[PDB]
Paper text:
The Vip3 (vegetative insecticidal protein 3) family proteins from Bacillus thuringiensis convey toxicity to species within the Lepidoptera, and have wide potential applications in commercial agriculture. The Vip3 proteins have molecular masses of ~90 kDa, and are secreted as soluble proteins that form tetramers in solution. Vip3 proteins are proposed to exert their insecticidal activity through pore formation, though to date there is no mechanistic description of how this occurs on the membrane.
We first examined the structure of the wild type, full length Vip3Bc1 by single particle cryoEM. The 3D reconstruction of the tetrameric assembly of Vip3Bc1 with a global resolution of 3.9 Å resolution was obtained (0.143 FSC threshold). Our Vip3Bc1 structure reveals a tetrameric assembly with C2 symmetry. Each tetramer comprises two dimers formed by conformationally distinct A:B monomers. Each monomer of Vip3Bc1 consists of 5 domains. Together, domain 1 and domain 2 form the N-terminal, largely alpha-helical portion of the protein. The two domains are connected by a contiguous alpha-helix (α3, residues 94-162) that interfaces with α2 (residues 61-88) undertaking a super-helical twist that gives the complex a distinct conical appearance. The interchain interactions that bring about the conical morphology and impart the C2 symmetry are formed at the interface between domains 1 and 2 on each of the monomers, with the rest of the complex not involved in oligomerisation.
Author numbering:
A (entry chain B): 27 to 653
B (entry chain A): 52 to 101
C (entry chain D): 52 to 151
D (entry chain C): 152 to 251
The structure:
């Protein structure tokens, strides 16, 4: 889909705040002290004692009675009235709560839960991405400046994340107003009461000499206003730009992703704080001003004194040894549509060595459209990238067109083990997102000798070893898909490994939109495929569309095995059907992939031949396979 | 069970109930001995009896 | 003595609350005795009885607060002050053992 | 002279005896953070100063709930200046700076 960037995310959290900020509390003093499980018990006492006291008081009010006897009965009346009054006061507090407050609060809380979930879907991806980045970074040769920010930030971060997690989950697991926690029977008032009490205890603990201290200092450390002004942003930039971190996306991609994680953390925490306050009694505090101010400060930091220092150069994440060919002259063309543009690449090999290329239209300020995207798969790319026991000529250049142009077609040429290519760019307009089709530039030769003299020289060569040449492997793209203006190949035969590399517009793609607080539209790098011949292959909407099940043991069931995702469930006769014959061109290869749990029966049948069938593997936990 | 409907505030309700029982007993004692004095109209006694 | 030394007690109105307690006690006693006279218009008796109940409630919680304060400032603070003054001197003595 | 400290901040990539500047910072920085935080509560004091002209004129017995609100932020912050806390942090910070 889309990721609307940090500014849009902040606007969303601010709208959630504006929602919760207003609704109601009536004051209602939600102090947990209320026993709240005797709303039945106290009522009996209140009723009986009321009857008794009324009878006796009316007997007195009859008058005409022995004076001292009247005094005695009046004192008894006073005592009973005192006891009954404090009892019914307690009951009245409890009942006023369980009628006026819990409906209101439950409604507002249920409302805040859903929009929180929606906004969490906006960073689910980058969560796991930063997890992966943390997995593949090493801090050898760190300076005392690193340990500085680490000790200056780690407790505040620990606790902010912990609170966000705890509260956000407790927003869900708290019974809603259907029960209304009413006196109905019991054990609803054990469990729902325990959970409500825990919510109460958590939110109470958020108004003291802490957690408005932790938030603020976290923001400060980010901006870099500590005792000797070293923004954790800058030290993270330094740590990431250190190599051995060769994964998807360039420097700017990774650091911006880091800042996304942290800013989302802070905004979530602000939301949680305001929710706590409203959940308690009074003195609402419009934090939106402080939150926006802090976010803008951190963004100003990132813009001014980190961004201009980073590279948009991005390389393949891994390599792979493969045996290719020499007797062939493979030629590969990756030509985007005339109104399209190249937006990154990917190399897979598990079915076979395959280069994949994405393409799409452009929105202003180097923004990509979600639709109009397309993935194209190509064949034995190794045979273009790998020899078989003979040397390989690789012309290596850092081809880059001037600004405003976008790489629009990359054609490869391998002629008698001489690997060159062709890079052609068109003109593009950042203000309108329009790409020109009548102002192009071409690059036929792939060295620096031709760069300075237009003469053929300065390639690099690889002497084919036995097992195979380390060919590129993985994804070739920024963390956010982005039209590239730089491209090149930089093979290092010193250890027989090849490497692709490009330069991305990401810097200018965001500097005009996000760090200026405008409607940003990025797209996280697609971890897997994005389209399929199988329409609605991503069954989740409880609707089959072109899918069809001719048996009630074959059902859609969004919660097939869990509500997390749908996966067409079939048991003992279940069959999901879909006519697909019209789209497969004859005598053409096709790759298949699917995430399956259990042992399903899969068939590609035209009632005469089953082009593929797998009915053997048993998968407990949704193993995906590709053939 | 028991705290199946409580939260180990068994003690809190326990002491509250104990205090209420004590006060109610103290009231009942004065009512009873005032009855024991007797010497009143039937209804002005029978109502007190009720 | 248990004495629950919770700071919540206002503890600076031990004078102020006493005036309220005394005046309201006098009023409530007068009115309650007027009722206990009996021989009066029934609905008027009910009205005055409700007034009695309200006044008795207010006075009762007020004098409860006062009684807590005064029970403290008579039973507890002497005891606690004595023990604390006792603990101070022996502490000082033992501190002279490590001053050097 | 606060800003000039950054002119050192950028170029203090110092190594080879970082154990001392690990110990001392790991020990000092909490109190420092807390002190700076308390101080910024006086930028919000300045916010209440900005509030002042909105209620300086209607101080005729209306403040009794108007200006008893409108400052509750400070009324809270100040309460967070007692009780085995911020005083402690100031004290220990001085103690370390002197080196006791």
């Amino acid at each position: 889909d889309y990721f609307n960037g940090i500014y849009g995310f902040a606007t969303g959290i601010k709208d959630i705040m504006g929602m919760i900020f207003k609704t109601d509390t009536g004051g209602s003093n939600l102090t947990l002290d209320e026993i709240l499980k005797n709303q039945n018990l106290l009522n009996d006492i209140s009723g009986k004692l009321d009857g008794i006291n009324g009878d006796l008081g009316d007997l007195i009010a009859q008058g005409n009675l022995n004076s001292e006897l009247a005094k005695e009965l009046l004192k008894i009346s006073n005592e009973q009235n005192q006891m009954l009054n404090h009892v019914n006061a307690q009951l009245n507090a409890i009942n006023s709560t369980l009628n006026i407050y819990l409906p209101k609060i439950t409604s507002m809380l249920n409302e805040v839960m859903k929009q929180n979930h929606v906004l969490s879907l906006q960073i689910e991806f980058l969560s796991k991405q930063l997890q992966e980045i943390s997995d593949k970074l090493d801090i050898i040769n760190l300076n005392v400046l690193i340990n500085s920010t680490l000790t200056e930030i780690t407790p505040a971060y620990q606790r902010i994340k912990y609170v966000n997690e705890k509260f956000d989950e407790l927003t869900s697991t708290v019974e809603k107003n259907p029960k209304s926690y009413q006196d109905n029977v019991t054990k609803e008032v054990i469990e729902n009461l325990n959970e409500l009490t825990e919510l109460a205890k958590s939110v109470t603990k958020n108004d003291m000499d802490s957690f408005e201290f932790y938030l603020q200092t976290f923001h400060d450390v980010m901006t870099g206003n500590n005792l000797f002004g070293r923004s954790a942003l800058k030290t993270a930039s330094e740590l990431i730009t250190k190599e051995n971190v060769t994964t998807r996306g360039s420097e700017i991609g990774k650091v911006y992703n880091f800042l996304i994680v942290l800013t989302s953390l802070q905004a979530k925490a602000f939301l949680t704080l305001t929710a706590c306050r409203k959940l308690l009694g009074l003195t609402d505090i419009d934090y939106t001003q402080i939150m926006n101010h802090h976010i803008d400060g951190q963004k100003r930091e990132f813009r001014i004194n980190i961004l201009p220092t980073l590279s948009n150069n991005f390389s393949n994440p891994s390599y792979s040894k493969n045996r290719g060919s020499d007797i062939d002259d493979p030629i590969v063309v990756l030509e985007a549509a005339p109104g399209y543009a190249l937006i990154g690449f990917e190399i897979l090999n598990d079915p076979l060595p395959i280069l994949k290329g994405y393409q799409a239209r452009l929105k202003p300020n180097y923004q990509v459209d979600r639709e109009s995207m397309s993935e194209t798969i190509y064949g034995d790319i190794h045979k273009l990238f790998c020899p078989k026991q003979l040397e390989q000529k690789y012309y290596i250049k850092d081809i880059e067109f001037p600004e405003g142009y976008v790489i629009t077609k990359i054609v490869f040429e391998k002629r008698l083990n001489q690997l060159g290519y062709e890079v052609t760019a068109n003109f593009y307009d950042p203000s309108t997102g329009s790409i020109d089709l009548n102002k192009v530039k071409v690059e036929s030769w792939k060295e620096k000798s031709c760069e300075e003299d237009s003469c053929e020289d300065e390639y690099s060569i690889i002497k084919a070893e036995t097992d195979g040449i380390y060919m590129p492997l993985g994804v070739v793209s920024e963390t956010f898909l982005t039209p590239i203006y730089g491209f090149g190949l930089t093979v290092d035969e010193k250890n027989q490994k090849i490497t692709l590399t490009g330069k991305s517009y990401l810097r200018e793609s965001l500097l005009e939109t996000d760090l200026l607080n405008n409607e940003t539209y990025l797209i996280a790098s697609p971890d897997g495929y994005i389209s399929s011949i199988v329409e609605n292959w991503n069954i989740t909407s409880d609707n089959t569309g072109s899918w069809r099940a001719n048996n009630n043991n074959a059902f859609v069931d969004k919660a097939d095995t869990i509500k997390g995702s749908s996966s067409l469930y079939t048991h003992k006769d279940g069959e999901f059907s879909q006519f697909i014959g019209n789209k497969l061109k004859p005598k053409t290869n096709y790759v298949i992939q699917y995430v399956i749990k259990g042992r399903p029966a899969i068939y590609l049948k035209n009632n005469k031949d089953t082009l593929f069938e797998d009915t053997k593997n048993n998968f407990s936990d949704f193993q995906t396979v590709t053939k």
